[PDB]
Short mmCIF file of C-alpha atoms in Angstrom, two decimals:
data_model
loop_
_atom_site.label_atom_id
_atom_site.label_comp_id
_atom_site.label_asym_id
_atom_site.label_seq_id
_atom_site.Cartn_x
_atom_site.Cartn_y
_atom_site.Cartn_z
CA UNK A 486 -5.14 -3.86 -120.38
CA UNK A 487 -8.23 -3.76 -121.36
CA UNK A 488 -11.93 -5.52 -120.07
CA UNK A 489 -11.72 -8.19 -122.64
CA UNK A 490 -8.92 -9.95 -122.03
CA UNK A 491 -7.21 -13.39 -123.74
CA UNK A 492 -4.67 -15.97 -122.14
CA UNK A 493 -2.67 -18.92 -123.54
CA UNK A 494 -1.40 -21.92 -121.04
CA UNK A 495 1.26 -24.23 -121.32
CA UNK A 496 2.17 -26.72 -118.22
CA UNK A 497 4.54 -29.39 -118.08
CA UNK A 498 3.96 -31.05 -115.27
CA UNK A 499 4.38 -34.47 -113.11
CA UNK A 500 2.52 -36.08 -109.83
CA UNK A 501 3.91 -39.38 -108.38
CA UNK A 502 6.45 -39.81 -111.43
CA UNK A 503 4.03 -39.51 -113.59
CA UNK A 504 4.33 -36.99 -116.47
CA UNK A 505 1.48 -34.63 -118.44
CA UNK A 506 1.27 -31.43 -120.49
CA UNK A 507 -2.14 -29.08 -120.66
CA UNK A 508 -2.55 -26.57 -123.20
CA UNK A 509 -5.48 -24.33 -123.21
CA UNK A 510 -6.92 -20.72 -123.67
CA UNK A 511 -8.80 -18.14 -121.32
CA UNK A 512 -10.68 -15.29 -121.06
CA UNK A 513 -11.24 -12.65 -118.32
CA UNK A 514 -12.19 -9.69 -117.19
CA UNK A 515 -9.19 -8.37 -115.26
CA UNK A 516 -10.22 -5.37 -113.81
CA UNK A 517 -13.30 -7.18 -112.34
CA UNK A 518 -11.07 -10.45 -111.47
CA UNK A 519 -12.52 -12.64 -113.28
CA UNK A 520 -11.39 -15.62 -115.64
CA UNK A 521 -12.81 -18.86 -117.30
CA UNK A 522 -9.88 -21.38 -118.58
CA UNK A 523 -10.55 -24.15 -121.15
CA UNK A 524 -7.53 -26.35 -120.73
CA UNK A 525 -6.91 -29.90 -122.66
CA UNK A 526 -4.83 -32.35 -122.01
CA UNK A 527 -1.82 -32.98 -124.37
CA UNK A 528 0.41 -35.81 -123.16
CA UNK A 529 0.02 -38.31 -120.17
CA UNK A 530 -3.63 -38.53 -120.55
CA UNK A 531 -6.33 -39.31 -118.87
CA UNK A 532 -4.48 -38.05 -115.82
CA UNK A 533 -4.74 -40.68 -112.82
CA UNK A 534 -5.17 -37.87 -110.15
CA UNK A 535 -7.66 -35.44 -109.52
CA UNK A 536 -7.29 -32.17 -111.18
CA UNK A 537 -7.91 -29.85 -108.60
CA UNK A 538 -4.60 -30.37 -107.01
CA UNK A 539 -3.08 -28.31 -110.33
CA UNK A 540 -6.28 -25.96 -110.99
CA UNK A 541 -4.52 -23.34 -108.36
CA UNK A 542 -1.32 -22.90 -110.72
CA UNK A 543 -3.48 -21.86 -113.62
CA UNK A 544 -2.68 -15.16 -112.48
CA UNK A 545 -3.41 -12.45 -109.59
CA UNK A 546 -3.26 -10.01 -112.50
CA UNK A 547 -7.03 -11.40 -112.36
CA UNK A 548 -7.60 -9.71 -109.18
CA UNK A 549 -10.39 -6.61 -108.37
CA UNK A 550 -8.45 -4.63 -106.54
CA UNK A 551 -9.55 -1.03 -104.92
CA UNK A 552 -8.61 1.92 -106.61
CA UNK A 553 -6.60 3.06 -103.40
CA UNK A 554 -4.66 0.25 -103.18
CA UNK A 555 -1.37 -0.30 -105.20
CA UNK A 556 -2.06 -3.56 -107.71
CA UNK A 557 1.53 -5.12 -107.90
CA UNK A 558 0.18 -7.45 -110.87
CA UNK A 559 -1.12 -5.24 -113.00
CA UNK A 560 1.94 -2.27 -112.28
CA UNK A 561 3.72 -5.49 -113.43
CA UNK A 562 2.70 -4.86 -117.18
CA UNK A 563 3.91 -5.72 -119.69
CA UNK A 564 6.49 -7.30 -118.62
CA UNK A 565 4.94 -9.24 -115.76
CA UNK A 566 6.16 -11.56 -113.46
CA UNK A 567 6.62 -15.00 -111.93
CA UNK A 568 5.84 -17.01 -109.04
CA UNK A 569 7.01 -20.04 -107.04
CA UNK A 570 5.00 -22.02 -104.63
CA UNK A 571 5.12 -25.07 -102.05
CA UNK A 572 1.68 -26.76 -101.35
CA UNK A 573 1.78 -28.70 -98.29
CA UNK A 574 -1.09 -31.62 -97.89
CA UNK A 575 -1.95 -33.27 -94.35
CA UNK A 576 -1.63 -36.82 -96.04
CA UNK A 577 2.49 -36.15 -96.42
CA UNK A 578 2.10 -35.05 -99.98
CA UNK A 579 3.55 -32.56 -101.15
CA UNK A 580 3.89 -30.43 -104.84
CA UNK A 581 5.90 -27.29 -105.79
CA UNK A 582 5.06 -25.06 -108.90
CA UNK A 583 5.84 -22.01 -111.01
CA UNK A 584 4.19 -20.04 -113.08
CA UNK A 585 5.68 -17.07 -115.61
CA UNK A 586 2.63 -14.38 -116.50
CA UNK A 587 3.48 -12.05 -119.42
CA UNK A 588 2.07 -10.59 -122.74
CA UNK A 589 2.24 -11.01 -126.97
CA UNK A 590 -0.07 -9.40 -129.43
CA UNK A 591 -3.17 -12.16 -128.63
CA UNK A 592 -2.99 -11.67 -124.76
CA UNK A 593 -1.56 -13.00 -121.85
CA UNK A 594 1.19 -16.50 -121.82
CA UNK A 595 0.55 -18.53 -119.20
CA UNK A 596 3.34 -20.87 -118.96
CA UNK A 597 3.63 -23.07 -115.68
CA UNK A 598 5.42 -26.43 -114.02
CA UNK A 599 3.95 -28.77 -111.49
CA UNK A 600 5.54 -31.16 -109.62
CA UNK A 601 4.37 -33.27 -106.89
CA UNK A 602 5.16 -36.17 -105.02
CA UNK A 603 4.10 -38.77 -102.10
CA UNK A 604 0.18 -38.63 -103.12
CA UNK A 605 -1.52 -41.81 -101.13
CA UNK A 606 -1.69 -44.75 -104.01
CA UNK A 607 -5.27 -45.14 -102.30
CA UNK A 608 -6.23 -41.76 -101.20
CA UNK A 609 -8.71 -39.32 -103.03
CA UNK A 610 -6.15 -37.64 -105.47
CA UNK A 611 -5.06 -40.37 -106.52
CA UNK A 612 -8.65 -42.12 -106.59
CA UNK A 613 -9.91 -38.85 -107.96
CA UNK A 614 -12.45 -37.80 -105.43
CA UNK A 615 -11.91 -34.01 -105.28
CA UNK A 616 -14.88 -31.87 -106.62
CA UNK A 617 -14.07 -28.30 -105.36
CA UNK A 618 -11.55 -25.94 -103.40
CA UNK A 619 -13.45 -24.48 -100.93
CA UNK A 620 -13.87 -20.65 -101.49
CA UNK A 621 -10.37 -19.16 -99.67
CA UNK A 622 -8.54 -15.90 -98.02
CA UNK A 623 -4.59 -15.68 -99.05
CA UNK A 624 -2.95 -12.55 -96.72
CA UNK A 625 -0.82 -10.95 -99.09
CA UNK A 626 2.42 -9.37 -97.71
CA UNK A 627 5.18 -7.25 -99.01
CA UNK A 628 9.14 -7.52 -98.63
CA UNK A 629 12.31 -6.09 -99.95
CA UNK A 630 9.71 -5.49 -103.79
CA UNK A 631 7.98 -9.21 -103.45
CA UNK A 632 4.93 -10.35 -102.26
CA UNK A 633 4.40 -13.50 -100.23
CA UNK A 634 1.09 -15.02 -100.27
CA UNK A 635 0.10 -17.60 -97.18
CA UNK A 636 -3.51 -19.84 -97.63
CA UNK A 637 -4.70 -22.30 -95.98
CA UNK A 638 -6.70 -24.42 -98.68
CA UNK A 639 -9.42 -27.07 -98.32
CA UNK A 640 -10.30 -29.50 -100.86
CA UNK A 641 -13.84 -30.76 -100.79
CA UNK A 642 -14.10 -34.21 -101.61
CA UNK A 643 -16.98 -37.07 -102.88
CA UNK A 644 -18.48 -38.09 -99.78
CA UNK A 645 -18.89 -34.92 -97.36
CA UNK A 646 -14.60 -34.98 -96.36
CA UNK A 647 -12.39 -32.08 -96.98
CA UNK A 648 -8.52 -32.66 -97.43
CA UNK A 649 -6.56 -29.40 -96.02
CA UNK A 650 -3.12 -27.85 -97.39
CA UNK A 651 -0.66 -25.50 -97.02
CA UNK A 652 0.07 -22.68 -99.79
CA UNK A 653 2.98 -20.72 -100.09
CA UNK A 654 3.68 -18.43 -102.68
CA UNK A 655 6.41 -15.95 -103.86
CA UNK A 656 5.06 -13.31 -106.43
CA UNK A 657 8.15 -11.42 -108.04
CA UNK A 658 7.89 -8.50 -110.69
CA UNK A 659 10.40 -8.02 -112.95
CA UNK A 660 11.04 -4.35 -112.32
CA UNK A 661 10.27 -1.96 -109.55
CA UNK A 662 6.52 -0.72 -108.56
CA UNK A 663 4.71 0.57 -105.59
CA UNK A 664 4.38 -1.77 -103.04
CA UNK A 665 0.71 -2.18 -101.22
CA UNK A 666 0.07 -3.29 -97.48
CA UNK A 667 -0.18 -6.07 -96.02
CA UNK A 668 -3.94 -7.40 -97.32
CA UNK A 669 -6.17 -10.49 -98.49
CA UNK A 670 -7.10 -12.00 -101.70
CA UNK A 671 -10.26 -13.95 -101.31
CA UNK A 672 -10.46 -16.16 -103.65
CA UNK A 673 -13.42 -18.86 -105.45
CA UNK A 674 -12.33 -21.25 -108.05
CA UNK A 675 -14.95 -23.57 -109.93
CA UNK A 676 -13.70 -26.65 -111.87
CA UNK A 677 -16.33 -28.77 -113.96
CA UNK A 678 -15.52 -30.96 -116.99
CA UNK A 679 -16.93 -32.26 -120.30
CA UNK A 680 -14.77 -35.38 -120.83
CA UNK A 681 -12.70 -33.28 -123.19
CA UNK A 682 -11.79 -30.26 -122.27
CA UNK A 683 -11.87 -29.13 -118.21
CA UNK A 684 -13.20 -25.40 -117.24
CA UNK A 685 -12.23 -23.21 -114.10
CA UNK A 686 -13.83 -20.04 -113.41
CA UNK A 687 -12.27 -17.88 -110.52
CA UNK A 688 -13.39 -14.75 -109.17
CA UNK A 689 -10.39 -13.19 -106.63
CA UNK A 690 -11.13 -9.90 -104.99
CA UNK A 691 -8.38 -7.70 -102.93
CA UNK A 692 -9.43 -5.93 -99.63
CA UNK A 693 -8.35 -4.71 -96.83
CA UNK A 694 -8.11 -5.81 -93.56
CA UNK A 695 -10.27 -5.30 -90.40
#
């Protein structure tokens, strides 16, 4: 690792039936978990949702975490790891995901899958009204050599509303490292577009609680 780091994304991905593929690159300083993504749409475009309902699946390696406090991401090098995750919204929809993190000689490979289902025809994903997750807390526990991560996420949306939903997530390394306590991730994600190509920034710190 180093403070300078480059990623590479690949999704295949579907919402309501309907099928897509982003490609894009990143850049981030780890150690100071922070990232900026510049992701393009391949195939199925212009999507016919709002984007922020994927943003999330696009890497806790990209997490400050204390120096006292065991970082299963980065211990995770080079191999890495993968993740699986349900997302539960309070309109009945519903997506699941995955995500595999790992390295070549440019940087990280980012390579994900989306899938989600029973989005209101008439509702502001589908009439692409998001504009921002709202800034969020995900307490991290550990299990048996995997982490579970548990947020409660609210998407802001045109108009002053905020739609709410559940996230779940499995984190699992591919080998055996020192496991950290239970903890939070807070997280801040930033989406804004061009027409062309669409930007997130997050910044995720780790701390303890109380």
């Amino acid at each position: 690792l180093k403070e300078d780091m480059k990623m590479t994304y690949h999704m295949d991905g579907s919402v309501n039936g309907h099928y897509f593929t982003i490609e894009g690159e990143g850049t981030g300083n780890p150690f100071k978990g922070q990232q900026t993504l510049k992701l393009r749409v391949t195939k199925g475009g212009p999507l016919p949702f709002a984007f922020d309902i994927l943003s999330p699946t696009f890497n806790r390696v990209f997490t400050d975490y204390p120096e006292d406090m065991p970082d299963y991401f980065k211990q995770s090098l080079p191999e890495g790891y993968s993740w699986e995750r349900t997302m539960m919204y309070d309109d009945g929809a519903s997506a699941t995901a995955s995500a595999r993190i790992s390295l070549d000689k440019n940087g990280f490979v980012h390579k994900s899958t989306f899938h989600g289902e029973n989005f209101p025809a008439n509702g502001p994903v589908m009439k692409k009204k998001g504009v921002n997750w709202e800034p969020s807390s995900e307490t991290i526990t550990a299990s048996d050599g995997i982490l579970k991560g548990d947020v409660t996420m609210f998407l802001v949306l045109e108009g002053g509303q905020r739609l709410k939903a559940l996230f779940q997530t499995t984190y699992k390394a591919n080998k055996v490292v020192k496991m950290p306590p239970r903890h939070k991730i807070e997280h801040r994600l930033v989406r804004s577009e061009d027409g062309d190509t669409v930007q997130l920034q997050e910044h995720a710190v780790a701390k303890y609680f109380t």
